[PDB]
Amino acid sequence: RKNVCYMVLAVFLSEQDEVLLIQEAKRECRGSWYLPAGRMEPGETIVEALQRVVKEEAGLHCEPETLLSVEERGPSWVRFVFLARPTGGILKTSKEADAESLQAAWYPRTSLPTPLRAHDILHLVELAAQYRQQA
Ligand SMILES: [Mg+2]
Ligand SMILES: [Mg+2]
Ligand SMILES: [Mg+2]
Ligand code: NA
Ligand code: NA
Ligand code: NA
Ligand code: NA
């Protein structure tokens, strides 16, 4: 009966203006960088999906701070973009590379790694930055 695909994405922006990025393992974009992101699974809530994607791709525990945006990528494709804060876990290094990601790392918002999986994350980091400024 499902007719829509919910996706989740996490923006972490530290006090030092660094963003948490993950390095993709998927063949089509292997070695490229992106935000922690993934499709919701049957049985979980959107916040549970956020936490799972962050754990799997970056190794960290987290909590959502706010919903920064909801995007209608298509009539049946919706992406929820959260500002998130780390609450524990261990940052995933390349020692732990697997199918979910090759590693995760923090980069200055203004000095991002390359190549990026997609550039749609630029705007998202700016959203976080503005939110943090407004708050
Ligand atoms: Mg992030
Ligand atoms: Mg860390
Ligand atoms: Mg305001
Ligand atoms: Na939860
Ligand atoms: Na925790
Ligand atoms: Na792009
Ligand atoms: Na993409």
PDB file of all heavy atoms in Angstrom, residues 45-49 51 62-64, ligand 4:
ATOM      1  N   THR A  45      10.523   5.022  12.428  1.00  0.00           N
ATOM      2  CA  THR A  45      10.066   6.395  12.275  1.00  0.00           C
ATOM      3  C   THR A  45      11.127   7.189  11.523  1.00  0.00           C
ATOM      4  O   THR A  45      12.245   6.703  11.320  1.00  0.00           O
ATOM      5  CB  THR A  45       9.911   7.048  13.647  1.00  0.00           C
ATOM      6  OG1 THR A  45      11.195   7.070  14.287  1.00  0.00           O
ATOM      7  CG2 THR A  45       8.921   6.250  14.502  1.00  0.00           C
ATOM      8  N   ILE A  46      10.800   8.410  11.123  1.00  0.00           N
ATOM      9  CA  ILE A  46      11.773   9.211  10.386  1.00  0.00           C
ATOM     10  C   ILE A  46      12.988   9.557  11.246  1.00  0.00           C
ATOM     11  O   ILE A  46      14.120   9.577  10.746  1.00  0.00           O
ATOM     12  CB  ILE A  46      11.146  10.482   9.771  1.00  0.00           C
ATOM     13  CG1 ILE A  46      12.143  11.174   8.844  1.00  0.00           C
ATOM     14  CG2 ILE A  46      10.666  11.431  10.860  1.00  0.00           C
ATOM     15  CD1 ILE A  46      12.529  10.354   7.628  1.00  0.00           C
ATOM     16  N   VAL A  47      12.792   9.803  12.531  1.00  0.00           N
ATOM     17  CA  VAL A  47      13.925  10.101  13.399  1.00  0.00           C
ATOM     18  C   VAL A  47      14.761   8.845  13.615  1.00  0.00           C
ATOM     19  O   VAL A  47      16.005   8.912  13.625  1.00  0.00           O
ATOM     20  CB  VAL A  47      13.477  10.737  14.732  1.00  0.00           C
ATOM     21  CG1 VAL A  47      14.661  10.889  15.685  1.00  0.00           C
ATOM     22  CG2 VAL A  47      12.858  12.085  14.462  1.00  0.00           C
ATOM     23  N   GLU A  48      14.114   7.689  13.742  1.00  0.00           N
ATOM     24  CA  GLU A  48      14.862   6.425  13.797  1.00  0.00           C
ATOM     25  C   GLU A  48      15.702   6.200  12.535  1.00  0.00           C
ATOM     26  O   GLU A  48      16.843   5.714  12.612  1.00  0.00           O
ATOM     27  CB  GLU A  48      13.934   5.234  14.034  1.00  0.00           C
ATOM     28  CG  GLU A  48      13.481   5.128  15.469  1.00  0.00           C
ATOM     29  CD  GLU A  48      12.298   4.207  15.636  1.00  0.00           C
ATOM     30  OE1 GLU A  48      11.881   3.560  14.652  1.00  0.00           O
ATOM     31  OE2 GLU A  48      11.787   4.137  16.764  1.00  0.00           O
ATOM     32  N   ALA A  49      15.154   6.550  11.376  1.00  0.00           N
ATOM     33  CA  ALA A  49      15.911   6.435  10.127  1.00  0.00           C
ATOM     34  C   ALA A  49      17.101   7.377  10.158  1.00  0.00           C
ATOM     35  O   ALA A  49      18.211   6.994   9.753  1.00  0.00           O
ATOM     36  CB  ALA A  49      15.028   6.740   8.925  1.00  0.00           C
ATOM     37  N   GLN A  51      18.772   8.458  12.762  1.00  0.00           N
ATOM     38  CA  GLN A  51      19.773   7.891  13.660  1.00  0.00           C
ATOM     39  C   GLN A  51      20.476   6.686  13.033  1.00  0.00           C
ATOM     40  O   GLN A  51      21.699   6.528  13.170  1.00  0.00           O
ATOM     41  CB  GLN A  51      19.151   7.574  15.022  1.00  0.00           C
ATOM     42  CG  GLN A  51      18.690   8.853  15.715  1.00  0.00           C
ATOM     43  CD  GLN A  51      17.767   8.601  16.886  1.00  0.00           C
ATOM     44  OE1 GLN A  51      16.836   7.789  16.807  1.00  0.00           O
ATOM     45  NE2 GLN A  51      18.017   9.301  17.988  1.00  0.00           N
ATOM     46  N   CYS A  62      23.294  10.240  17.540  1.00  0.00           N
ATOM     47  CA  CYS A  62      22.877  11.626  17.386  1.00  0.00           C
ATOM     48  C   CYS A  62      21.437  11.845  17.816  1.00  0.00           C
ATOM     49  O   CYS A  62      20.673  10.901  18.023  1.00  0.00           O
ATOM     50  CB  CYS A  62      23.063  12.088  15.933  1.00  0.00           C
ATOM     51  SG  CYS A  62      21.925  11.322  14.749  1.00  0.00           S
ATOM     52  N   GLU A  63      21.091  13.114  17.952  1.00  0.00           N
ATOM     53  CA  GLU A  63      19.716  13.514  18.172  1.00  0.00           C
ATOM     54  C   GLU A  63      19.408  14.654  17.223  1.00  0.00           C
ATOM     55  O   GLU A  63      20.277  15.475  16.933  1.00  0.00           O
ATOM     56  CB  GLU A  63      19.499  13.962  19.617  1.00  0.00           C
ATOM     57  CG  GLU A  63      19.614  12.845  20.652  1.00  0.00           C
ATOM     58  CD  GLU A  63      18.479  11.834  20.576  1.00  0.00           C
ATOM     59  OE1 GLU A  63      17.452  12.110  19.910  1.00  0.00           O
ATOM     60  OE2 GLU A  63      18.619  10.759  21.192  1.00  0.00           O
ATOM     61  N   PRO A  64      18.175  14.694  16.711  1.00  0.00           N
ATOM     62  CA  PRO A  64      17.787  15.811  15.850  1.00  0.00           C
ATOM     63  C   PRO A  64      17.636  17.080  16.670  1.00  0.00           C
ATOM     64  O   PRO A  64      17.116  17.027  17.790  1.00  0.00           O
ATOM     65  CB  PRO A  64      16.420  15.378  15.318  1.00  0.00           C
ATOM     66  CG  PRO A  64      15.872  14.471  16.404  1.00  0.00           C
ATOM     67  CD  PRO A  64      17.076  13.733  16.922  1.00  0.00           C
TER      68      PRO A  64
HETATM   69 NA    NA B   4      14.364   7.998  18.016  1.00  0.00          NA
END
